[PDB]
Amino acid sequence: EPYEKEVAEYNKHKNENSYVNEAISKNLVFDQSVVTKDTKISSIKGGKFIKATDFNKVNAGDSKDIFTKLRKDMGGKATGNFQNSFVKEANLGSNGGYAVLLEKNKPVTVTYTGLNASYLGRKITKAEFVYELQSSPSQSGTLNAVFSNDPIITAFIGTNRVNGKDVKTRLTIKFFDASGKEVLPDKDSPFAYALSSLNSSLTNKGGHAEFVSDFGANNAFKYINGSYVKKQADGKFYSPEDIDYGTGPSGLKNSDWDAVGHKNAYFGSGVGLANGRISFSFGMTTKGKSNVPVSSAQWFAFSTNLNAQSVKP
């Protein structure tokens, strides 16, 4: 471990040390092209539901964006059902989503049906996204989630911050073919998935970063050259400096890169590679500070739209 911290440290303010690069095969297609008129969440199992009328309440003077709605402690305020947990918000797409409480040791399985995804020409019509809380900074130790009926918008997750702990969620995904059989990669054609939009405002005074970590068995993170997202001493992958408000050595601001489709969107991306079932964690870290604003709700989108074509081997 001490030698990986040293590898991280030398690489912090550099681009790739080498020219070595291997093409990423895009065998797995899980992107906007796979959403159909029939795509939807068919069920959510394992989690208590949050009534939309509880989820939509904010405090006087608050903005009503989805992140602000997310940053409240709903432990013990999750008495909804699948019907009344349905929420509309433009960030969820035109078909909306569902509010759910995530709790320690209670994985929540979100099933999508009606897909037209593929892997080497095998049609993927259904998927299970399993979310499991791993870290929460709220008093109740819970997280709130809104799961979108668009699997490419995926999830918004957050809670109130009372201490310095990370927000962290494990996501394990199963893809199914039309016959109902799980689709797993062939030996020489791993799954590739994007880890995008990992913004960071981290400074010595404070701020926070969105990260990925804890890549599961047969999964690995791969660096994109010129990306600010790279492995840190704590084992997580994020930008250790501010690319959001312009105070960092690069002077970059969120509007300079953090948009889907931006030429600079790779600034906050990596690539996930899986020779097996996809599984990894995502979250938010203040590196331990408790009074950091807007540092406990995030949007995590899942797709195969990589912001690169090759990676370091």
Side-chain angles (χ1 to χ4, degrees):
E1 187 55 30
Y3 84 86
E4 317 169 39
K5 297 166 158 126
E6 210 55 15
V7 168
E9 217 300 340
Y10 188 76
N11 282 148
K12 195 30 55 48
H13 293 121
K14 309 213 187 331
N15 296 310
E16 193 94 66
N17 66 331
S18 196
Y19 42 76
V20 291
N21 79 94
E22 42 175 25
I24 310 146
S25 67
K26 338 273 199 163
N27 322 108
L28 174 68
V29 183
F30 202 92
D31 60 25
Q32 211 48 246
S33 74
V34 317
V35 183
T36 81
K37 57 157 141 145
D38 300 303
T39 299
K40 69 168 170 275
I41 293 172
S42 53
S43 67
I44 304 176
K45 293 274 183 290
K48 294 181 166 71
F49 293 97
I50 302 166
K51 308 172 120 164
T53 58
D54 292 325
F55 175 76
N56 281 326
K57 288 177 167 185
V58 301
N59 281 116
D62 283 348
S63 303
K64 298 261 300 176
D65 61 285
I66 193 162
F67 304 104
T68 294
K69 291 176 180 185
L70 284 165
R71 296 188 307 267
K72 62 173 166 282
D73 189 339
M74 299 299 277
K77 290 131 264 181
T79 61
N81 59 36
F82 186 62
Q83 199 284 322
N84 61 31
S85 72
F86 176 78
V87 291
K88 299 169 227 53
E89 138 69 41
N91 272 13
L92 293 178
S94 56
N95 283 333
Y98 306 89
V100 177
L101 186 82
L102 304 179
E103 299 179 80
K104 198 66 182 81
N105 304 311
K106 296 162 186 161
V108 172
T109 302
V110 178
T111 299
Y112 294 94
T113 56
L115 307 175
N116 184 42
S118 54
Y119 169 71
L120 307 170
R122 301 156 59 180
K123 179 151 153 164
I124 291 163
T125 57
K126 164 173 133 164
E128 287 173 348
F129 284 54
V130 178
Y131 297 89
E132 189 169 349
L133 183 155
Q134 293 188 305
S135 187
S136 159
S138 59
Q139 184 60 45
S140 66
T142 58
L143 293 165
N144 313 316
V146 181
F147 302 120
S148 170
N149 271 309
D150 186 336
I152 308 301
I153 292 174
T154 325
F156 295 78
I157 290 174
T159 190
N160 184 42
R161 178 173 290 284
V162 308
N163 56 50
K165 293 169 94 328
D166 289 355
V167 176
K168 192 171 80 177
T169 306
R170 183 157 63 198
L171 171 58
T172 305
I173 295 161
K174 291 185 190 179
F175 304 112
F176 298 91
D177 74 23
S179 82
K181 175 56 170 190
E182 190 177 3
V183 176
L184 294 165
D186 293 338
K187 165 168 161 51
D188 287 309
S189 300
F191 288 163
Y193 48 101
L195 306 158
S196 292
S197 196
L198 301 171
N199 59 295
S200 176
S201 62
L202 280 168
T203 73
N204 45 281
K205 251 166 176 78
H208 79 272
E210 309 198 350
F211 65 89
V212 293
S213 67
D214 306 296
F215 281 79
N218 318 306
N219 289 244
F221 177 103
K222 287 293 200 173
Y223 175 67
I224 302 168
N225 192 29
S227 167
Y228 286 75
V229 174
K230 42 190 68 158
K231 191 174 196 203
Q232 304 303 130
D234 56 32
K236 304 167 201 152
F237 301 85
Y238 57 95
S239 170
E241 287 219 289
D242 169 44
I243 58 188
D244 279 353
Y245 296 98
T247 87
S250 88
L252 272 169
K253 266 130 78 198
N254 196 269
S255 60
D256 292 315
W257 63 274
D258 192 2
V260 170
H262 198 289
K263 79 154 177 152
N264 288 347
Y266 75 101
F267 285 2
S269 309
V271 180
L273 282 161
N275 301 286
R277 191 175 296 133
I278 291 177
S279 186
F280 62 96
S281 297
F282 60 90
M284 316 173 73
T285 189
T286 56
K287 287 172 118 306
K289 283 121 202 168
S290 75
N291 287 318
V292 179
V294 297
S295 67
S296 49
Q298 73 194 120
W299 172 27
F300 186 78
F302 178 81
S303 85
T304 55
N305 282 125
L306 319 181
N307 291 310
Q309 323 255 53
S310 60
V311 291
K312 175 170 233 197

